[PDB]
Amino acid sequence: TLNGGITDMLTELANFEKNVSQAIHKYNAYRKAASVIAKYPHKIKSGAEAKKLPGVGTKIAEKIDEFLATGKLRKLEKIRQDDTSSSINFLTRVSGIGPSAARKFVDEGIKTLEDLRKNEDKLNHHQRIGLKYFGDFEKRIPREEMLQMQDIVLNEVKKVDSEYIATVCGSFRRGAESSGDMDVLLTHPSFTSESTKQPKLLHQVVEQLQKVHFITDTLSKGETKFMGVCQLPSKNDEKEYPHRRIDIRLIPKDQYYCGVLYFTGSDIFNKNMRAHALEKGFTINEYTIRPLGVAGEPLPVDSEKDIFDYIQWKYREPKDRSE
DNA sequence: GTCGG
DNA sequence: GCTGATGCGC
DNA sequence: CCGACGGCGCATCAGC
Ligand SMILES: Nc1ccn([C@H]2C[C@H](O)[C@@H](COP(=O)(O)OP(=O)(O)NP(=O)(O)O)O2)c(=O)n1
Ligand SMILES: [Mg+2]
Ligand SMILES: [Mg+2]
Structure with a gap:
């Protein structure tokens, strides 16, 4: 560069x-x-x-x-x-260990990978999985593997309920030749901003992906956001693929365009765009764009481009959002 | 740390 | 148990 | 100068 x-x-x-x-x-x-x-x-x-x-x-x-x-x-x-800066910066590389926990661990004399492995009982669930896959999580994912993962996720979602739509977002949707993880946006017509006509919509998908041994671990899980670990299947006599981070976000189906804008990112692009929206008198989240009066009612949105139009930005394709 | 009013 | 803060992450 | 800096889901904890 x-x-x-x-x-x-x-x-x-x-x-x-x-x-x-x-x-x-x-x-x-x-x-x-x-x-x-x-x-x-x-x-x-x-x-x-x-x-x-x-x-x-x-x-x-x-x-x-x-x-x-x-x-x-x-x-x-x-x-x-x-030494203290070096230790803290190292420990935060474990998923689930942030600045505060890293400084706390250093205070307690836990400051190497060896220390962490010896003190798993002092880690919460997320941190324990982050430590388990510490090496794997620092590897990047070739887009070719992202394509295999996409095919698995979309086909397994189809088997649960053909009315699900799963969209791979993040750096993948921006066309990256490699990604740090996989980000999947999920919709189902039963879940809208007006009602949830069916329970366990996210759970059913997680369950199916665990059943076929794609999802291997869970870092956190609620009604709309799953954060976990997945792994491609390997062939006979083949070395296993690295375990990968996966995030799944169930978004109201009528709010897909705001959701796909958010989940496509990048994070800095979202920060710049939402900051611009504020200067234009709007506020944007993954559900809605609303005017600032205090936020008003959601504005009609029928494409990603409608959102850009409101804030007077020319449209930017996902591949041009890698800030 | 940078920026806008 | 609930609610609100805080940490950590998307 | 100096207030604002994007917006929110899940896990954990403290206080009642
Ligand atoms: N602070 C953040 C972090 C993430 N996201 C959004 C935008 C991002 O594109 C998406 C997925 O997050 P990510 O951490 O997986 O980032 P990514 O763009 O996919 N890049 P990478 O996963 O490292 O290849 O969530 C955001 O809005 N704000
Ligand atoms: Mg990603
Ligand atoms: Mg992600």
């Missing part, structure tokens, strides 16, 4: 602020700057040039000048040397 050295530096700063400092707005600011620089179509020559981009301010411009001049950032070189 054209400015990969810079965007990597900013991401590392973002992670430090989130995981160690617990300064969430600094985390968001660093990721916004990294995002806008990532899509800038020139090799950046100076901090001043970058400060012209929205989300890059004075402090990030100065860091870019240091990085361009020396290839490194003294602030990060010191952070990498610090």
Whole structure:
């Protein structure tokens, strides 16, 4: 990538602020700057040039000048040397261990993978599964495997009830050649914003995917959101595929376009778009777009493009939403 | 950390 | 048990 | 200056 050295530096700063400092707005600011620089179509020559981009301010411009001049950032070189920052940043890589829990574990002398494995009884269910698949969860998923997973999920959903519609969203729907996980949007005509005419709609699908041994583990599960683990089947004598993260979101069927907009992302694109909506006098969530008067009644939406129209954005195909 | 009013 | 906060994640 | 920063599901806990 054209400015990969810079965007990597900013991401590392973002992670430090989130995981160690617990300064969430600094985390968001660093990721916004990294995002806008990532899509800038020139090799950046100076901090001043970058400060012209929205989300890059004075402090990030100065860091870019240091990085361009020396290839490194003294602030990060010191952070990498610090044992407590290093430990906390490591522990947060386990799914279910956040900044607070990582600092608590370090206080208790739990700070390596070996320590975690020795202290499984001190982990909640989510953390215990995150530890179990720690290596697998850091692997990426080739799009070819995403296509196999898509075929399994859609066909098994079809067998439960041909009226389900399952849509793979996330980075996959944005056309990524690899994904960190699989995100599945689910609808069924019995579940609308006006009524739930059938119970266990999400459960039935989860159950079926467990029955055929696709879903292997559950991190969390409610009426509309499942968060778990899945695995492709392998052939005779074949090494097994890595276990993968899977999220499933049941959305009211009449609210599919707001739901698919949300679940297609990226997260930064959603943040930019919802922030823009506010400046335009609307609020967007995964169910509705509503005017700000306090939020008013939902506006009619019959395509993803209707949502862009309301906030006066030209439409952006999913592949162009990877901010 | 950055931005807009 | 319920409700509201908080952590963690999408 | 300085308030705002997207919006919400599930797990866990504290207080009643
Ligand atoms: N903070 C976040 C995180 C996620 N999402 C939405 C947008 C994202 O596209 C989708 C799925 O989340 P994800 O973490 O799986 O991200 P992804 O875009 O699929 N990328 P990846 O899974 O790493 O390949 O949920 C969001 O709105 N806000
Ligand atoms: Mg994803
Ligand atoms: Mg996901």
